[PDB]
Design a protein around this motif. Structure first.
Motif, PDB file in Angstrom:
ATOM      1  N   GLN A 573       0.804  -1.211   0.000  1.00 44.12           N
ATOM      2  CA  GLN A 573       0.000   0.000   0.000  1.00 44.12           C
ATOM      3  C   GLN A 573       0.841   1.266   0.000  1.00 44.12           C
ATOM      4  N   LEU A 574       2.118   1.168   0.373  1.00 40.25           N
ATOM      5  CA  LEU A 574       2.997   2.329   0.304  1.00 40.25           C
ATOM      6  C   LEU A 574       3.133   2.824  -1.125  1.00 40.25           C
ATOM      7  N   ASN A 575       3.254   1.902  -2.079  1.00 38.58           N
ATOM      8  CA  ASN A 575       3.347   2.307  -3.477  1.00 38.58           C
ATOM      9  C   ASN A 575       2.096   3.056  -3.914  1.00 38.58           C
ATOM     10  N   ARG A 576       0.921   2.547  -3.544  1.00 40.40           N
ATOM     11  CA  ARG A 576      -0.321   3.219  -3.906  1.00 40.40           C
ATOM     12  C   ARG A 576      -0.410   4.596  -3.264  1.00 40.40           C
ATOM     13  N   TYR A 577      -0.017   4.699  -1.993  1.00 41.65           N
ATOM     14  CA  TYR A 577      -0.054   5.988  -1.315  1.00 41.65           C
ATOM     15  C   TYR A 577       0.882   6.985  -1.980  1.00 41.65           C
ATOM     16  N   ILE A 578       2.086   6.538  -2.340  1.00 37.17           N
ATOM     17  CA  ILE A 578       3.034   7.416  -3.015  1.00 37.17           C
ATOM     18  C   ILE A 578       2.474   7.865  -4.354  1.00 37.17           C
ATOM     19  N   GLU A 579       1.866   6.942  -5.098  1.00 35.62           N
ATOM     20  CA  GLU A 579       1.278   7.297  -6.384  1.00 35.62           C
ATOM     21  C   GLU A 579       0.199   8.359  -6.221  1.00 35.62           C
ATOM     22  N   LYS A 580      -0.710   8.152  -5.268  1.00 35.27           N
ATOM     23  CA  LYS A 580      -1.789   9.111  -5.061  1.00 35.27           C
ATOM     24  C   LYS A 580      -1.246  10.471  -4.645  1.00 35.27           C
ATOM     25  N   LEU A 581      -0.288  10.485  -3.717  1.00 36.54           N
ATOM     26  CA  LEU A 581       0.270  11.751  -3.263  1.00 36.54           C
ATOM     27  C   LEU A 581       0.986  12.470  -4.397  1.00 36.54           C
ATOM     28  N   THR A 582       1.732  11.728  -5.213  1.00 35.24           N
ATOM     29  CA  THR A 582       2.420  12.338  -6.342  1.00 35.24           C
ATOM     30  C   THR A 582       1.428  12.952  -7.316  1.00 35.24           C
ATOM     31  N   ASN A 583       0.339  12.242  -7.612  1.00 31.37           N
ATOM     32  CA  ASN A 583      -0.651  12.786  -8.535  1.00 31.37           C
ATOM     33  C   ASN A 583      -1.283  14.054  -7.980  1.00 31.37           C
ATOM     34  N   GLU A 584      -1.686  14.027  -6.709  1.00 28.43           N
ATOM     35  CA  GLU A 584      -2.344  15.200  -6.152  1.00 28.43           C
ATOM     36  C   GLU A 584      -1.387  16.371  -5.984  1.00 28.43           C
ATOM     37  N   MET A 585      -0.086  16.111  -5.847  1.00 28.98           N
ATOM     38  CA  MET A 585       0.875  17.208  -5.846  1.00 28.98           C
ATOM     39  C   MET A 585       1.077  17.762  -7.250  1.00 28.98           C
ATOM     40  N   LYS A 586       1.160  16.881  -8.249  1.00 30.41           N
ATOM     41  CA  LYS A 586       1.383  17.327  -9.620  1.00 30.41           C
ATOM     42  C   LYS A 586       0.230  18.190 -10.108  1.00 30.41           C
ATOM     43  N   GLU A 587      -1.004  17.757  -9.850  1.00 27.03           N
ATOM     44  CA  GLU A 587      -2.146  18.527 -10.327  1.00 27.03           C
ATOM     45  C   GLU A 587      -2.231  19.895  -9.668  1.00 27.03           C
ATOM     46  N   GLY A 593       6.549  18.691  -3.925  1.00 28.14           N
ATOM     47  CA  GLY A 593       6.501  17.380  -4.532  1.00 28.14           C
ATOM     48  C   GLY A 593       7.715  16.999  -5.341  1.00 28.14           C
ATOM     49  N   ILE A 594       8.679  17.910  -5.488  1.00 29.48           N
ATOM     50  CA  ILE A 594       9.902  17.588  -6.216  1.00 29.48           C
ATOM     51  C   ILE A 594      10.612  16.416  -5.558  1.00 29.48           C
ATOM     52  N   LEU A 595      10.590  16.372  -4.225  1.00 30.90           N
ATOM     53  CA  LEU A 595      11.163  15.241  -3.508  1.00 30.90           C
ATOM     54  C   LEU A 595      10.561  13.927  -3.981  1.00 30.90           C
ATOM     55  N   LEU A 596       9.260  13.918  -4.261  1.00 32.02           N
ATOM     56  CA  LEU A 596       8.615  12.694  -4.719  1.00 32.02           C
ATOM     57  C   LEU A 596       9.007  12.372  -6.155  1.00 32.02           C
ATOM     58  N   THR A 597       8.682  13.269  -7.086  1.00 38.05           N
ATOM     59  CA  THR A 597       8.896  12.982  -8.501  1.00 38.05           C
ATOM     60  C   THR A 597      10.377  12.919  -8.840  1.00 38.05           C
ATOM     61  N   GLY A 598      11.136  13.921  -8.422  1.00 38.56           N
ATOM     62  CA  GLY A 598      12.514  14.036  -8.841  1.00 38.56           C
ATOM     63  C   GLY A 598      12.624  14.758 -10.165  1.00 38.56           C
ATOM     64  N   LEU A 599      13.863  14.890 -10.633  1.00 39.63           N
ATOM     65  CA  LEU A 599      14.137  15.612 -11.874  1.00 39.63           C
ATOM     66  C   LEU A 599      13.903  14.687 -13.069  1.00 39.63           C
ATOM     67  N   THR A 600      12.626  14.383 -13.289  1.00 36.00           N
ATOM     68  CA  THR A 600      12.208  13.583 -14.433  1.00 36.00           C
ATOM     69  C   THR A 600      11.041  14.255 -15.141  1.00 36.00           C
ATOM     70  N   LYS A 601      10.408  13.535 -16.069  1.00 40.45           N
ATOM     71  CA  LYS A 601       9.269  14.096 -16.788  1.00 40.45           C
ATOM     72  C   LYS A 601       8.158  14.498 -15.830  1.00 40.45           C
ATOM     73  N   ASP A 602       7.955  13.718 -14.768  1.00 41.94           N
ATOM     74  CA  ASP A 602       6.989  14.107 -13.750  1.00 41.94           C
ATOM     75  C   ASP A 602       7.387  15.423 -13.100  1.00 41.94           C
ATOM     76  N   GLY A 603       8.676  15.586 -12.806  1.00 43.31           N
ATOM     77  CA  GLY A 603       9.147  16.861 -12.298  1.00 43.31           C
ATOM     78  C   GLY A 603       8.911  17.989 -13.279  1.00 43.31           C
ATOM     79  N   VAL A 604       9.081  17.711 -14.571  1.00 38.82           N
ATOM     80  CA  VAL A 604       8.827  18.726 -15.587  1.00 38.82           C
ATOM     81  C   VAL A 604       7.362  19.138 -15.573  1.00 38.82           C
ATOM     82  N   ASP A 605       6.456  18.166 -15.468  1.00 39.61           N
ATOM     83  CA  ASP A 605       5.034  18.488 -15.431  1.00 39.61           C
ATOM     84  C   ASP A 605       4.685  19.294 -14.188  1.00 39.61           C
ATOM     85  N   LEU A 606       5.237  18.905 -13.041  1.00 41.34           N
ATOM     86  CA  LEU A 606       4.987  19.653 -11.816  1.00 41.34           C
ATOM     87  C   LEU A 606       5.493  21.082 -11.946  1.00 41.34           C
ATOM     88  N   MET A 607       6.685  21.254 -12.512  1.00 38.55           N
ATOM     89  CA  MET A 607       7.234  22.589 -12.688  1.00 38.55           C
ATOM     90  C   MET A 607       6.391  23.404 -13.657  1.00 38.55           C
TER      91      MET A 607
END
Ligand SMILES: [Zn+2]
Ligand SMILES: [Zn+2]
Ligand SMILES: [Zn+2]
Ligand SMILES: [Zn+2]
Lengths: 771, 319, 81
Positions: A573-587, A593-607
Motif C-alpha cells: 500500500q505504500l506504493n499506492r499511497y506514493i502514487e496518489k500523493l504524487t498525482n495530487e501534488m502534480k495537479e 513534490g519535487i522530492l517525490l517525482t525528482g528531476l524527471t518528466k513528472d518533475g517537468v510536469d509539476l514545474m
C-alpha cells in the motif's frame, strides 16, 4: 424647467431656477470641515447660498445680463408674458436703478417662449412669445437705463432664438414649421428654410457656421453656409431630449441630456465619424446641466432633490507599460507615471519585481551550499525553502556516493523497488533493521544524517535548539518513545502552559477497544489549533494499519508524512499511497513534490503547473539545471523557460548577469551550442585562421594582414597570478563597413583622438556608426 | 499599492496615443495636430524631446515601435487611408526620415501592429472596411521595399488587432481581430486566424460567440512559457479568456487546431465603455482604462482568482 | 481552549498501582493555576482513605471542603478534622 446658470464674469457664482430662484457662491472645503448651511458640491468643494428670491412665481424663461454692472442681474419672462428685470446682488450703488424692476408687458396676453441678450450690445433684449392671431411673435426691446425696438414673426411661433456671435444685426429664430434668419437692416430680408427640428438652436463658439437643433429624440446639425438640409443626424434616443449645449472650453464638443436620465451623452464633431461618450455624474436623474464658461472642461448638474454636483469631464486615456513595471498613461495634455508603493511588506509585490530583486542579489548562483538560496530569496516562502533543502540533501548524497543518479529519480522510483517489510502488530514503547530503500528515503527526508546511524537524537536536539517543540515531540513519538516526548514537552513548557496539560493527557494511552480516553480523544482531537498535536493524537487513536488521518493531513510538511509512511506503512500500500500523493501534488503544482517525482518528466510536469500558477521562470530554470539527466535538458519546455528568462534579463539591461548565467548553463549543460558569429579567412588559402611563425597562416604559411598603424603583420599565439600569453591589446579589430582594421590598442588610441578611418582615401566614420 | 506622479513633459495639443520602445528608454506620442514627438530619458531620469514633425493629411490614430534588432523604426496609421514607416538617421541631431507608405486601403486605416521578432519584419494593418493586410519586408537592410503577403476579409468593421507573442516551436502564428459595429443583431465580434503551414494561408480558427457588444480593444498576454494563451477584451465590461490547445491526434494533421475556451474574469467596475487594456512584461498585471476617467489595475491572487489591486484617476489624484 | 485539553487529560483515570498516568499526573498537577483542577487531580491520584491533599488546600472555599469531608470521611476522622 429648472436650470442652472453661471455668472458671465464670475467663476464662483451661479443661479438655480425653480419656484424660488436661489443664487449660490462656491467655496473650497478641502482643508475645512463642512461649513454650516454649505452644500458639499463635491468631496472638497462647498457651495454657500448667497440669496433667495420668491417674487417670481411660475417662471417660464430666464436670462442673465451680460455687462458687468450691475452684478447678479437677470430677466424672467412669465407665463402671462410679463418680462421683469430682477437683481440678487448686494448692490447699494446701482448705476441706473430705473431699470431695476423694469417690466415689459405684451400688448396681447401670450406666453413668452424664449428670451436672450444681444452679445454685441447688452442693451438689446430679444424675446419670442406665443403665437398670436395677427401679431408679431418676436420682439426686440431696449433696456436703456415705450414700445419694443422691433417686432417680427407675425402669426408665427418663436420656439427659440439666438444671435449671431459676430454680426450685431443677425438673428436666428425657430418658427412654427420653419427656421428663419433675419437681418436688422431690413425686416423683409430674411432667409427661411422649412424644417422639423426647431428647438434648442445654438452655435458652436469655435465654428460660427455650425448650428444644432433637436425634435423629440432626434438631433440634427446644420452648416449656415450651406443650410439647406441637415449636415448630420445623431442617433435617436428613446427618451425625449431635454437640453443640448456646446462646450466653450473645448472645440467641437456637444453635450445632450434627455428626459429622466442619469447619464449625459457627449459627441465629438471635431472630426471635420462622430465619437460618442457617456458620463454618469450621480446616482439620480439630472434635472439640468451647465458648462462653466471659463473653467476648463467643467460642468455642473442638478438633481430634482435640490442636490447639485460639479465635475470635470475627463478625456480618453492612453496607456503604456515599461519593462520595470511602471505604468505610464496620458490624459489630455499631461503624462503620469505609476509605480508600486515602497512599503516594508515586500511579500505582496509582483513577480516581476521580485525576480529583478533576486537577480540583483545573485539568486541561485551559490553552488557551494545550495540551501542558502532560500536566504538569498529575500522573502519568506516555505515552498522555496523545501525545494532548496531537498536539492541540498540530494547533492550531499551524490557527493558522498562519488566519494565512496538513482537519487535524482525521486522517492517514487526509489521505493518502487522496495521489498521485504513486515508490519508491526503492537507498539513496544522501548532503525538499521529496515530495508535500504527506506533508509535512503529517510536520509532524503532529513531525519537521519549521512551513514547508517540508528539514532535520530541529533535531529531531535537540533529541533530543540530550533525551538519547534511540537514537531520535535511528534517525531520523537513517531520513533516510539513516549517518555522522551513528555520530557521534551516539559522542557518546552518550562520556557515561554498548554504543553504541560498536553503532556499529562498524553500519558493516558490504552489499548482497550472501548476506552473512554480513546473515545473522548478521538471525538475532541480535531478541536486543537496546532496541526502536529492533532496528527499525533490521530496516530495514537488510530487502529492498526489504518493511519489515514495522519497520512492525509495537509497542514503537515510533506517530508514528515513521507518519512512516517516509509517507516510504518506496508510496501504493497505504500506504493499506492506514493502514487496518489504524487498525482495530487502534480495537479496542484506545489513545489514540495519535487522530492517525490525528482528531476524527471513528472518533475517537468509539476514545474510546468507551478509556472502556470505563478509565472516564475527564474526558479524553474535554476532548478532544472541541477545535475538533471541529459534527456530532461532536451525537453522543449525547459529550453523555452530558459530562453524566456534570458530575454527577460536582456529587457532590463542586466547584460553582465546574463553572461554569468550563460557561463553557468554552458558549464552544466553540454548540449547547448554557444552563439555563432563571424570568423576571419586567409586571402590566399581561403581557410579559417582560427585554432611556424605566429604571423603566418597556419595552412599556407603566407603572411597575415598587417595593422594599419604599426605596419606589422598581426598574429596571436594559439594552443591565476601568472603571465598572460595573448594580451587584449593585440587582438584583431576591424570596421565592419570599411573592412579596415588592426591591433586593438592602436586603433583604440587613434579613434580616441580622431574620427576617420586611418587608411588613406577612406571616408568611413567607423566609431560613430555604432552610436 | 500603486502610487502616481506627474512627469514634467510639456504638450500643446491633445495626446492621442503614447508608446514605449523595447527597453523602456524611448517614448513616441501622437498629438491632435497631426504631429509626432519622440522623448528620451536621460541618465538622471528626466525626459527630453528629440524630434517632431507633421506626417499625414488626416488624423493620426496609432504609432508603434519596432524591435531594436531591426534598428529604430516607427509605424504610424492615419485616417487619410495611409500607413507610414519612419526610420531615424543621425549624422548629432536626430533626423527622422520616412521610408515607405502603404496606401492599399480603401477606407480609413484603423490600426497597425508589428509582428513578433522571431517571424522576421512583418506588419499588419486593419482598416474600417473589414480588411486586414499583412506585409513583409524581404530585405532588412532595405526598408523602402515592402510586399503585400496576405489579405483577409472579416465582413465586419475592424477596430483593433493583436498578434500572439508566443515564440514556441509548437504554436503556429496567431492574430486576433475585433470589431466595433453596433448592429442591432447579435453577431460575433471577435475572430481568431491561425496560419497553416501546409497551405501557407491564414484561416479562421475560433470565434468568440459569447461576445456580442461592440469591442474597442483586444490584447494577448505575453506567453512566458505557459501551456495556454490569455486574451483580454475591452467592452462595456472587461473580460479575460483562456485558450488551451487540444492534443492533436497523430492519425492525421488537418486544419486549424481545436481550442477550449473558458472565461476566468469579468469585471464591471468601470460602469462605462472600457477603452484601453494592456499587459505588463510578464503577463501578470492587467491595466484597464474606461470612460469613468479612472485607471484600474487587476492581478491574480493566492487562490488564482482575479481581483482589483489599483484604482487611479486621470488627474493623478489617488482614490 | 485549555479546557478541552484538560477534559481530554481527565479521561485517563486509572486505579493501577504503577500506572504512568498516576505517576505523572500527581507530579505535574502542582503547576496549574486554578486550584479546583489541582484538588480534582489530587483527589483522583490520592491513596484511598487519606484525602489530605484536598482537605488541607486553603486556596479553595471552605464549604466545598466541608461537604467533601462529610460525604466520605469516617466518623472519628470527620470529628478530628
Ligand atoms: Zn592561408
Ligand atoms: Zn575604412
Ligand atoms: Zn569603415
Ligand atoms: Zn597595430
Amino acid at each position: 424647467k429648472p436650470d442652472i446658470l453661471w455668472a458671465p464674469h464670475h467663476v464662483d457664482r451661479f443661479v438655480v431656477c425653480d419656484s424660488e430662484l436661489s443664487l449660490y457662491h462656491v467655496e473650497s472645503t478641502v482643508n475645512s470641515e463642512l461649513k454650516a448651511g454649505s452644500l458639499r458640491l463635491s468631496e472638497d468643494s462647498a457651495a454657500t447660498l448667497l440669496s433667495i428670491n420668491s417674487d417670481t412665481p411660475y417662471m417660464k424663461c430666464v436670462a442673465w445680463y451680460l455687462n458687468y454692472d450691475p452684478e447678479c442681474l437677470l430677466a424672467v419672462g412669465q407665463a402671462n408674458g410679463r418680462v421683469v428685470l430682477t437683481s440678487l446682488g448686494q448692490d447699494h450703488n446701482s448705476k441706473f436703478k430705473d431699470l431695476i424692476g423694469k417690466e415689459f408687458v405684451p400688448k396681447h396676453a401670450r406666453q413668452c417662449n424664449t428670451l436672450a441678450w444681444n452679445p454685441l450690445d447688452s442693451n438689446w433684449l430679444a424675446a419670442g412669445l406665443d403665437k398670436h392671431r395677427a401679431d408679431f411673435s418676436v420682439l426686440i426691446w431696449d433696456i436703456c437705463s415705450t414700445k419694443p425696438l422691433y417686432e417680427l414673426g407675425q402669426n408665427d411661433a418663436c420656439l427659440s432664438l439666438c444671435w449671431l456671435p459676430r454680426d450685431q444685426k443677425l438673428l436666428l429664430a425657430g418658427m412654427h414649421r420653419n427656421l428663419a434668419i433675419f437681418d436688422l437692416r431690413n425686416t423683409s430680408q430674411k432667409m427661411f428654410v422649412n424644417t422639423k427640428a426647431v428647438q434648442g438652436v445654438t452655435v458652436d463658439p469655435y465654428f460660427h457656421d455650425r448650428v444644432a437643433s433637436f425634435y423629440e429624440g432626434q438631433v440634427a446639425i446644420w452648416d449656415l453656409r450651406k443650410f439647406e438640409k441637415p449636415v448630420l443626424t445623431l442617433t435617436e434616443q428613446p427618451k425625449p431630449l431635454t437640453k443640448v449645449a456646446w462646450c466653450p472650453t473645448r472645440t467641437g464638443l456637444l453635450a445632450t441630456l434627455t428626459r429622466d436620465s442619469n447619464i449625459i451623452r457627449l459627441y465629438d464633431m471635431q472630426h471635420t465619424t462622430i465619437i460618442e461618450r457617456s458620463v454618469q455624474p450621480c446616482d439620480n436623474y439630472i434635472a439640468s446641466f451647465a458648462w462653466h464658461p471659463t473653467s476648463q472642461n467643467r460642468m455642473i448638474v442638478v438633481t430634482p432633490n435640490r442636490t447639485m454636483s460639479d465635475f470635470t469631464v475627463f478625456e480618453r486615456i492612453s496607456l503604456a507599460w515599461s519593462p520595470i513595471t511602471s505604468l505610464m498613461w496620458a490624459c489630455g495634455r499631461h503624462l503620469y507615471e505609476c509605480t508600486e508603493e515602497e512599503n516594508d511588506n515586500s511579500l505582496e509585490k509582483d513577480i516581476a519585481t521580485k525576480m529583478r530583486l533576486r537577480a540583483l542579489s545573485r539568486y541561485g548562483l551559490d553552488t557551494e551550499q545550495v540551501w542558502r538560496n532560500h536566504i538569498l530569496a529575500g522573502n519568506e516562502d516555505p515552498q522555496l525553502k523545501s525545494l532548496w533543502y531537498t536539492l541540498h540533501f540530494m547533492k550531499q548524497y551524490t557527493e558522498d556516493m562519488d566519494q565512496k543518479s538513482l537519487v535524482y529519480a525521486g522517492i517514487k522510483s526509489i521505493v518502487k523497488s522496495s521489498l521485504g517489510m513486515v508490519e508491526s502488530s503492537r507498539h513496544n514503547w522501548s532503525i538499521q533493521n529496515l530495508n535500504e530503500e527506506r533508509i535512503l528515503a529517510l536520509q532524503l527526508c532529513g531525519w537521519i544524517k549521512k551513514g547508517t546511524d540508528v539514532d535520530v537524537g541529533p535531529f531531535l536536539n537540533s529541533l530543540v535548539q530550533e525551538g519547534e517543540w511540537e514537531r520535535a515531540a511528534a517525531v520523537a513519538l513517531f520513533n516510539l518513545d513516549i517518555r522522551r516526548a513528555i520530557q521534551i514537552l516539559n522542557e518546552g513548557a518550562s520556557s515561554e502552559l498548554n504543553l504541560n496539560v498536553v503532556a499529562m493527557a498524553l500519558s493516558g494511552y490504552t489499548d482497550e477497544k472501548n476506552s473512554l480516553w480513546r473515545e473522548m480523544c478521538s471525538t475532541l482531537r480535531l478541536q486543537l489549533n496546532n496541526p502536529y498535536l492533532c496528527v499525533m493524537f490521530a496516530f495514537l487513536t488510530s487502529e492498526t494499519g489504518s493511519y489515514d488521518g495522519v497520512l492525509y493531513e495537509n497542514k503537515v510538511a510533506v517530508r514528515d508524512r513521507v518519512a512516517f509512511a516509509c517507516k510504518f506503512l506496508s510496501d504493497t500500500q505504500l506504493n499506492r499511497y506514493i502514487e496518489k500523493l504524487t498525482n495530487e501534488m502534480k495537479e496542484a503544482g506545489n513545489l514540495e513534490g519535487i522530492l517525490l517525482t525528482g528531476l524527471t518528466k513528472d518533475g517537468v510536469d509539476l514545474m510546468e503547473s507551478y509556472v502556470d500558477r505563478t509565472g516564475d521562470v527564474q526558479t524553474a530554470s535554476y532548478c532544472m539545471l541541477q545535475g538533471s539527466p541529459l534527456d530532461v535538458l532536451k525537453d522543449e519546455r525547459v529550453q523555452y523557460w530558459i530562453e524566456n528568462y534570458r530575454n527577460l534579463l536582456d529587457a532590463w539591461r542586466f547584460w553582465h548577469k546574463r553572461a554569468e548565467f550563460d557561463i553557468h548553463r554552458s558549464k552544466l549543460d553540454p548540449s547547448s551550442k554557444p552563439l555563432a558569429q563571424v570568423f576571419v579567412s586567409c586571402n590566399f588559402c581561403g581557410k579559417s585562421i582560427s585554432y611556424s611563425k605566429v604571423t603566418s597562416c597556419p595552412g599556407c604559411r603566407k603572411p597575415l594582414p598587417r595593422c594599419a598603424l604599426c605596419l606589422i603583420n598581426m598574429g596571436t599565439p594559439v594552443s591565476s597570478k601568472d603571465k598572460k600569453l595573448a594580451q587584449f591589446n593585440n587582438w584583431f579589430t576591424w570596421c565592419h563597413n570599411c573592412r579596415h582594421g588592426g591591433h586593438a590598442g592602436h586603433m583604440l588610441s587613434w579613434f580616441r583622438d580622431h574620427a576617420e578611418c586611418p587608411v588613406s582615401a577612406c571616408t568611413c566614420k567607423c566609431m560613430q556608426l555604432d552610436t | 499599492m500603486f502610487v502616481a506622479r506627474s512627469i514634467a513633459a510639456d504638450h500643446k495639443d491633445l495626446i492621442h496615443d503614447v508608446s514605449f520602445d523595447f527597453h523602456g528608454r524611448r517614448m513616441a506620442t501622437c498629438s491632435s495636430d497631426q504631429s509626432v514627438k519622440v522623448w528620451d530619458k536621460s541618465e538622471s531620469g528626466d525626459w527630453h524631446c528629440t524630434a517632431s514633425w507633421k506626417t499625414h493629411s488626416g488624423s493620426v490614430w496609432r504609432v508603434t515601435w519596432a524591435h531594436p534588432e531591426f534598428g529604430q523604426v516607427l509605424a504610424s496609421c492615419s485616417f487619410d487611408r495611409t500607413a507610414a514607416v519612419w526610420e531615424e538617421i543621425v549624422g548629432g541631431q536626430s533626423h527622422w526620415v520616412k521610408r515607405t507608405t502603404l496606401v492599399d486601403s480603401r477606407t480609413s486605416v484603423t490600426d497597425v501592429k508589428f509582428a513578433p521578432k522571431h517571424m522576421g519584419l512583418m506588419l499588419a494593418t486593419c482598416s474600417a472596411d473589414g480588411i486586414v493586410r499583412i506585409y513583409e519586408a524581404p530585405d532588412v537592410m532595405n526598408l523602402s521595399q515592402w510586399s503585400l503577403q496576405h489579405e483577409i476579409s472579416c465582413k465586419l468593421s475592424c477596430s483593433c488587432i493583436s498578434w500572439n507573442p508566443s515564440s514556441s516551436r509548437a504554436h503556429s502564428p496567431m492574430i486576433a481581430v475585433g470589431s466595433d459595429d453596433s448592429s442591432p443583431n447579435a453577431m460575433a465580434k471577435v475572430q481568431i486566424f491561425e496560419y497553416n503551414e501546409n497551405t501557407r494561408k491564414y484561416a479562421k480558427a475560433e470565434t468568440l460567440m459569447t461576445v456580442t457588444d461592440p469591442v474597442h480593444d483586444i490584447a494577448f498576454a505575453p506567453n512566458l512559457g505557459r501551456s495556454f494563451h490569455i486574451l483580454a477584451i475591452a467592452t462595456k465590461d472587461v473580460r479575460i479568456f483562456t485558450l488551451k490547445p487540444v492534443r492533436k491526434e497523430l492519425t492525421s494533421s488537418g486544419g486549424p487546431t481545436k481550442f477550449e475556451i473558458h472565461i476566468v474574469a469579468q469585471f464591471d467596475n468601470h460602469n462605462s465603455q472600457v477603452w484601453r487594456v494592456s499587459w505588463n512584461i510578464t503577463g501578470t498585471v492587467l491595466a484597464s482604462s474606461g470612460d469613468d476617467g479612472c485607471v484600474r489595475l487587476w492581478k491574480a491572487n493566492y487562490m488564482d482568482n482575479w481581483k482589483c489591486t489599483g484604482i487611479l484617476k486621470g488627474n493623478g489624484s489617488p482614490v
